Amino acid sequence: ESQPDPTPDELHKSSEFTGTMGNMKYLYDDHYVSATKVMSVDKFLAHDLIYNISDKKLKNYDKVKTELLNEDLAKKYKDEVVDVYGSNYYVNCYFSSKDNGGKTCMYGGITKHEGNHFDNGNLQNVLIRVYENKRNTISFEVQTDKKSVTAQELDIKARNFLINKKNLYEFNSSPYETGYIKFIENNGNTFWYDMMPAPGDKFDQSKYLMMYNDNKTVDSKSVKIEVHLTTKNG
């Protein structure tokens, strides 16, 4: 059932990352694709869905392709009226089955619209407890209008806050060596994501965001979230 917590040696270390940390910051700093009540209009590969979603802010795209874990998930949502929320990227983002208004890519981030909102039309607050060197230092709430929300949406909102409040990610590096965000569902199931880039000198945005392809959702009203960081080394 539950994924065991991170073993000490498996967590990505920022001291072992030689690329530009600002490329990780870019994915969570007031950065996200949003849409309500849309239906896919095309596909590229068997596991992805393309939607007509325009960029309200910077006007950088009008088409969004989201890749999912497998063909089953893609077929499930293909003709569904859904809402979308996720982190997009442009580097190594391609369409055209031959030759197939900007375009952008993402992973998962989709939920059915019908029956997924609160009866009184209010927003649900989700508590995020932050731990620094095993000590709970601060806690803050993020908001969502979805009863069943993708873990991706909550993670993004959490990191956006931490970037501003705790300088989670900066241009060169991070004041933290290690970091992971853990979700705890009211059924006892737990899972986590490594918040640091893979070792090396070149951050691969597409490959990192791929972890959201399972389109994992949680109950916003009951889920618990813990962010565990370490400055550990120094």
Of 13-21, 48-56, 110-118, 166-174, the segment contacting Zn ion by CB under 5 A is 110-118
Place of tokens 């000490």: 8
Strands lying side by side in the sheet with 82-86: 33-38, 82-86, 110-112
Residue for token pair 């929320």:
85
For Zn ion, the closer CB: 36 or 167:
36
Is the CB of residue 1 less than 8 Å from the CB of residue 174? no
Surface-to-core class of residue 181, CB atoms within 10 Å of its CB (0-12 exposed, 13-18 middle, 19+ buried): buried
CA distance 169 to 162: 8
Name the DSSP letter for residue 141: E
Residues 6+ apart with CB under 8 A from 119: none
Q: Which stretch binds Zn ion (CB under 5 A): 58-66, 108-116, 148-156, 206-214?
A: 108-116
Is the Cβ of residue 36 or residue 231 nearer to Zn ion in the bound state?
36
Give me the residue label for tokens 């959201």.
Answer: 212
Asked whether position 232 contacts Zn ion by CB under 5 A, the answer is: no
Asked if 153 interacts with Zn ion (CB under 5 A), we say no
* Options 21-29, 31-39, 97-105, 135-143: segment touching Zn ion (CB under 5 A): 31-39
Q: How far is the CB of 112 from Zn ion (least distance, A)?
A: 8
Q: Do residues 14 and 173 make contact, with C-beta atoms less than 8 angstroms apart?
A: yes
- Annotation: binding site for Zn(2+): 9, 47, 71, 80, 83, 113-114, 117
> Torsions phi, psi of 127, nearest 5?
-75, 130
According to CB under 5 A, which one of 48, 83, 155, 177 is a site residue for Zn ion?
83
13 scored as a contact of Zn ion (CB under 5 A): no
- Tell me if 112 contacts Zn ion by CB under 5 A: no
Q: Candidates 35-43, 53-61, 172-180, 212-220: pick the segment binding Zn ion (CB under 5 A).
A: 35-43
Among 47, 113, 216, 221, binds Zn ion (CB under 5 A): 113
- Chain residues in the site for Zn ion (CB under 5 A): 36, 83, 113
